């Protein structure tokens, strides 16, 4: 079983990212689960969403505390949120930032990887919608889900090019 934690702010659609990840994984033939951190979403407030991947139906109903992978939608969150908290040593943190991995200086053993994402969004989409584009980066960084399945999901529910670029840039 693999566990994924997504960090964002109220209004940035972190739940949608989690959902799209679970949809895309299932297209790949992996059993999936996705959920928001349970509570009220305030615009601007730090929020979390979660995804689980498995070869078998997922029956587990507890929260996620120790993720294999972490996605950070907003670089400003690093100042107030311990995004590396509970991550396995062989894990990967994907961060939406202009800066390169080492510049961020996170106290973790996990691989830190970066993409601009925000720029990719403004260039190709026009709006700074990063919740879907970062999934492209997730696929490129981890190889856990096929990038084509993520494209499929986003087009199904509703961008694909922005996903594609982020996949390359990571």
């Amino acid at each position: 079983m693999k566990e994924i934690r997504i960090h964002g702010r109220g209004g940035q659609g972190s739940v949608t990212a989690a959902e799209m990840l679970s949809v895309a994984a299932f297209e790949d033939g992996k059993f999936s689960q996705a959920f928001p951190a349970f509570g009220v979403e305030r615009r601007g407030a730090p929020v979390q969403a979660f995804t689980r991947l498995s070869d078998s139906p997922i029956r587990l109903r507890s929260q996620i505390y120790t993720p294999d992978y972490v996605i950070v939608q907003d670089a400003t969150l690093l100042e107030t949120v311990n995004v590396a908290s509970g991550i396995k040593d062989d894990g990967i943190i994907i961060i939406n930032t202009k800066e390169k991995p080492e510049d961020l200086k996170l106290d973790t053993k996990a691989r830190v990887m970066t993409v601009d994402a925000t720029k990719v969004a403004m260039d190709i989409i026009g709006l700074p919608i990063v919740n879907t584009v970062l999934l492209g980066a997730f696929a490129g960084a981890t190889g856990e889900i096929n990038v084509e399945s993520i494209k499929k999901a986003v087009k199904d529910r509703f961008n694909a090019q922005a996903i594609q670029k982020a996949y390359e840039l990571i």
């Binding site: 702010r9 601007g44 407030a45 730090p46 400003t76 969150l77 100042e79 949120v81």
Partner: protein
Amino acid sequence: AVPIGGTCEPGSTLANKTGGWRNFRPVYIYEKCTKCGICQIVCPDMSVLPREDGFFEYNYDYCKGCGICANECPADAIEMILE
């Protein structure tokens, strides 16, 4: 400890710094300020503090960077900068 209630102390939300909510931050351009006092009134987060000199200053511990003060300023004496 949980009191029998459980009653809360007044103004105890000070323990919760909401300055970390900001994507944008207001900055006073003091040269442009007319000291009209609108920014103090319109702040949802009581993060505009009065001064003896009649100017105002931000409590960046709490400011959520909504940009209402900047929007309502009749003097364009507030700038929103990224962060």
